Every structure is written in structure tokens, then in C-alpha cells.
Amino acid sequence: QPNRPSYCTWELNATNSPHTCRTKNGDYTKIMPDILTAIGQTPLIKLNNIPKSYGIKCEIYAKCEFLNPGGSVKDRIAYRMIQDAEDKGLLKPGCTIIEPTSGNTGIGLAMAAAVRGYKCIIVMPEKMSDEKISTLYALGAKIIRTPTEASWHSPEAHISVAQKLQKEIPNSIILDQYTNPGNPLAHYDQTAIEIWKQCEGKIDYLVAGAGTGGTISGIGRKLKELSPNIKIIAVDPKGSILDPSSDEVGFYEVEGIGYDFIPTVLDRNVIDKWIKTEDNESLNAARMLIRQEGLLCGGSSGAALIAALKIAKDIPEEKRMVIILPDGIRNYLTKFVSEYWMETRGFLQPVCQNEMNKWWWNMKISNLSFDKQSLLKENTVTCQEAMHMLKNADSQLLVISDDNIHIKGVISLNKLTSYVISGIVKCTDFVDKAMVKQYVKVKHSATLGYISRVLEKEPYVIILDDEHDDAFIGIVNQFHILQFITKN
Numbered sequence: 328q329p330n331r332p333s334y335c336t337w338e339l340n341a342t343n344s345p346h347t348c349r350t351k352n353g354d355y356t357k358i359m360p361d362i363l364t365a366i367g368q369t370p371l372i373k374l375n376n377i378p379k380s381y382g383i384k385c386e387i388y389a390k391c392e393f394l395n396p397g398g399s400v401k402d403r404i405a406y407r408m409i410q411d412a413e414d415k416g417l418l419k420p421g422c423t424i425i426e427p428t429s430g431n432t433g434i435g436l437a438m439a440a441a442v443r444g445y446k447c448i449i450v451m452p453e454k455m456s457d458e459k460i461s462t463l464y465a466l467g468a469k470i471i472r473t474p475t476e477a478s479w480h481s482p483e484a485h486i487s488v489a490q491k492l493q494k495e496i497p498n499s500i501i502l503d504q505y506t507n508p509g510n511p512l513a514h515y516d517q518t519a520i521e522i523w524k525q526c527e528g529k530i531d532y533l534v535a536g537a538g539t540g541g542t543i544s545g546i547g548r549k550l551k552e553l554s555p556n557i558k559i560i561a562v563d564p565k566g567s568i569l570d571p572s573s574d575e576v577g578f579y580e581v582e583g584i585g586y587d588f589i590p591t592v593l594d595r596n597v598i599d600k601w602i603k604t605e606d607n608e609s610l611n612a613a614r615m616l617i618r619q620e621g622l623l624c625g626g627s628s629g630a631a632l633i634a635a636l637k638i639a640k641d642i643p644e645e646k647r648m649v650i651i652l653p654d655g656i657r658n659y660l661t662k663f664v665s666e667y668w669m670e671t672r673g674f675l676q677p678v679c680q681n682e683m684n685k686w687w688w689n690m691k692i693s694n695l696s697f698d699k700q701s702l703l704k705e706n707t708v709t710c711q712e713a714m715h716m717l718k719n720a721d722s723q724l725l726v727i728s729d730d731n732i733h734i735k736g737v738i739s740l741n742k743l744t745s746y747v748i749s750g751i752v753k754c755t756d757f758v759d760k761a762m763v764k765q766y767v768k769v770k771h772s773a774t775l776g777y778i779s780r781v782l783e784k785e786p787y788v789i790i791l792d793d794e795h796d797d798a799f800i801g802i803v804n805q806f807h808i809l810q811f812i813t814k815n
């Protein structure tokens with residue numbers, strides 16, 4: 328159980344500790360034996376334009392963890408845990424490392440396992456995040472998929488099934504970044520020390536986001552031991568219970584911060600204040616870091632920046648603040664880096680490039696007229712019949728609904744062909760097995776410029792009725808847009 332209470336007896340400035348102490352990971356001045364020894368020693372860069380544009384009088388330095396060789400801060404822990412395991416004899420050559428995370432920790436453990444010749448197996452359902460799949464497959468990791476709906480309570484969830492797979496595979500191990508002292512200890516021993524030395528002893532506030540609390544708790548313990556007056560600020564997104572002030576749990580786009588449980592490695596006694604963030608301000612702040620500061624970073628970095636800017640309004644000029652930037656743009660290239668993805672989610676407004684289009688740009692989809700496709704029921708149509716229908720369909724998609732009103736899922740030719748070839752779906756089986764539960768849905772009241780912008784990637788868009796119970800209306804493609812534009 329990752330949510331169990333911690334048994335750690337540490338108190339401030341305590342001497343004798345059972346844990347290992349790793350000061351430095353390697354020496355850049357001479358030849359390094361492996362890429363893992365290059366983890367850490369990341370630069371602390373000043374923010375120049377962003378704080379002065381926001382009227383902040385004090386100094387703000389970003390510790391860049393996207394410059395680690397794996398691309399994230401998680402390298403630090405992925406090494407450390409493994410290291411400690413190897414000193415306990417738990418890790419042998421030929422061992423298989425299993426971790427229940429879809430985040431950057433899987434990439435760190437995949438890289439370290441590649442260096443050490445360990446098999447690596449990562450468990451994540453569906454796609455929560457993508458472009459990390461290519462990186463994990465490139466590093467030699469096996470990826471196991473589960474149902475994405477199952478809560479971490481459910482056995483179908485990635486954690487429980489990760490333990491089941493651990494029991495199935497002989498002589499395997501789970502490092503469990505949530506319960507592992509190596510996670511906070513890596514930042515206690517190294518990250519916090521690097522920040523302390525680089526600041527030359529002058530540091531006042533430290534802002535970081537906590538997914539697992541490892542970073543903020545390790546740096547909080549070490550820095551609070553070195554500088555008792557330091558203020559440690561944690562950043563949690565809306566929809567996560569990590570904040571001691573909470574209440575339900577929501578859905579946010581920003582990856583890497585917040586959880587629906589309270590990890591063991593997170594020590595909330597060293598957290599002075601919690602700041603809550605939203606996807607919009609966070610992601611636009613990350614784009615702001617990239618644009619104004621030339622720092623290529625992820626969304627959690629933007630969340631850190633927004634929290635720090637909220638706190639720093641009244642902070643006097645002589646103080647220094649340090650914020651942690653956990654990872655880089657690599658994973659997010661198609662999500663918050665893309666203007667299309669930003670305008671789709673509503674985080675940016677689509678701009679009308681040609682003034683000729685100005686008349687139909689703000690018109691609603693309601694002015695359009697398109698077919699309302701019959702909603703098929705559950706467990707009726709065989710795939711043969713659905714091959715026929717998809718061939719004959721206007722927009723070449725099928726709609727499956729149990730309620731006859733709201734659309735439960737969709738059927739596409741690509742998913743169907745994938746499942747038929749892989750053997751998951753026999754020809755005479757039911758198409759509901761190949762159903763796609765995630766899909767693009769747009770309110771009936773949206774403007775035609777938004778729809779035309781979304782259609783540049785998605786060939787189809789499901790229109791739902793915002794006034795009555797998100798009721799299914801019809802499917803819209805670029806044919807309807809051209810037909811509305813040209814015939815005026």
C-alpha cells in the first residue's frame with residue numbers, strides 16, 4: 328500500500344540514520360564510466376524577463392531538471408533506488424524491474440536498466456500520455472496495458488496488476504517510488520545540496536510541485552536542516568488530495584503532480600504552504616517559460632512558476648526564491664507545445680487568419696445542418712455488418728449507445744482492423760469489443776472557427792447537445808464546413 332503512514336523516525340538535525348548517503352553521482356571533468364553517473368549537477372538559471380514583467384521585486388531562480396540525461400528529474404531517483412537495491416543484494420544480473428508508473432520514472436528506470444542489463448517492464452493503461460511509449464520501447468522496456476477506468480483500489484489497476492505480474496515473474500522486484508526512501512533521499516542528498524552550494528548559502532523560498540512529494544520532502548528536509556528560516560512551498564493541481572485542504576477529485580491535463588492518495592515518501596511537516604493550480608495558467612506559464620526564458624520544460628514547470636509568482640508579489644527585493652522545473656518539452660511536443668492542442672482544450676483562442684472568413688467564424692454549429700446517425704445498441708451488430716456499414720457510412724464512423732440518447736462509444740475502421748488482425752475480435756464477434764471509449768466531442772453551441780480548427784487533425788467530430796443532457800446530435804467533418812463556406 329503506497330498510502331500507508333510513514334514509519335520514518337527522522338526529526339530535524341538528527342545524526343545517526345539507517346539510510347545510505349550519496350553525495351555526488353560522478354565527475355564531469357574526466358571520462359565517466361556510464362550515462363547514469365551523469366545524472367544530476369543541473370544548472371540553476373536566473374529568470375530575467377518573466378518576474379519583472381509580473382512586477383516581482385525579488386529574485387527567482389529555476390533549477391532545471393530537464394537537463395538530466397533521461398530528460399527528467401526522475402533519473403535521480405531511478406538511479407538511487409536501484410543503487411540502494413544493489414547494495415542490499417536485491418538486484419541481480421538478469422533481474423526484471425517492474426514499476427507501476429506511466430510518468431518519467433519509467434523512463435529513468437528503463438535507462439538505468441538498459442545500462443545495467445536489467446529487464447524492464449512498465450505498466451500503464453490505455454494512453455494517459457504519449458510519445459513516452461516510443462521512448463520506452465526504444466530503451467528496451469516491455470509495456471503492459473490495463474483498463475484505464477479501474478481505480479487504484481481495483482485489481483485491474485496498474486499497481487495491483489504490477490504486483491500480480493511481480494508474483495508471476497520469478498526473481499523480479501518493484502522499487503515503488505511511493506514507499507521507497509531512495510526517492511526523497513536522492514533529493515535530500517544531492518538536489519538540495521546542489522541548490523545550496525549554487526545559491527552560496529542564500530536561499531529563502533523553494534517552490535516545487537509534488538506528485539509523490541519526494542522532491543519537495545527531500546529538499547525540504549535537507550534545506551530546512553541547513554537554513555531553518557527557509558519556506559518550503561508545495562504545488563498541487565486542482566483535483567488532487569495531496570493538499571491537507573481538499574474538501575472531489577477531478578481530471579487535469581498537467582502531468583506529474585498530484586495523486587488520489589497520500590504517498591508515504593511525502594512529509595507534510597516540512598511543507599510551509601500549499602498552492603493550488605489550474606491547467607490553463609500552468610500550461611500558458613510553461614509556454615511563457617519557453618518563449619521568454621528560453622527554457623524548454625513541461626507543464627509541471629509552469630505550475631511551479633505560477634505558484635511562485637502568486638507568492639512573490641509582496642516578497643522584498645533582497646530575498647531569493649528557487650523553483651524546480653521537473654522535465655522538458657520532449658513528452659509534451661504534441662500536447663501543450665502544440666497551438667492546435669491548446670486551442671482545442673480552450674487554453675488558447677483560435678485566431679482567424681483570413682478576414683474573408685470573418686463572417687462564418689463566430690457562427691455556431693447550430694446554423695449547420697448534418698445527418699443524425701442512428702445510434703446502434705449494445706451487443707447487436709457483428710463486425711461483418713459493421714464493415715458493411717462503415718463502408719456505407721457518411722462520415723465513416725459508428726455510434727454505440729446504451730441509452731438511445733447519449734453516445735457511449737464509437738467504431739472506427741482503424742481500431743476494428745487492428746483488433747481483427749491481432750485476433751482480439753473474430754469476424755462474427757460483436758463490434759463493442761473494438762469500441763473506442765475516448766473520442767472528440769464538441770458542444771452544439773461552439774463556433775465554426777473552433778470546429779474548422781479542430782478538423783485539421785481529427786477527421787470527424789461528435790456534436791453533443793449542451794442544453795439537453797449532452798444528447799447526441801450528429802457527426803461533423805470537413806465536408807460540412809466546405810459546404811457551408813462555399814454555398815454561403
Ligand code: HEM
Nearest residue numbers: 333334335336337341342343344507508511512515545592
Ligand atoms: C537521522 C535521520 C533518519 C532516521 C533516524 C530515519 C529513520 C527511519 C527508519 C528507522 C525507517 C525504517 C522504517 C521501517 O522499518 O518501516 C525509515 C524509513 C523511511 N525513511 Fe527515514 N530516517 C532518517 C532520515 C530520512 C530522510 C532524510 C528521508 C528523506 C529525505 C527519509 C525517508 C524515509 C522514508 C520515505 C521511509 C519509508 C517509511 C516506510 O517504509 O514506512 N528518512 N526511516
Ligand SMILES: *Cc1c(COP(=O)(O)O)cnc(C)c1O
Nearest residue numbers: 537538539540541542583627653
Ligand atoms: C514526479 C514528477 C513531479 C513531482 O515530483 P515528486 O518527486 O513527485 O515531488 C513533477 N513533475 C513531473 C514531470 C514528474 O514526473
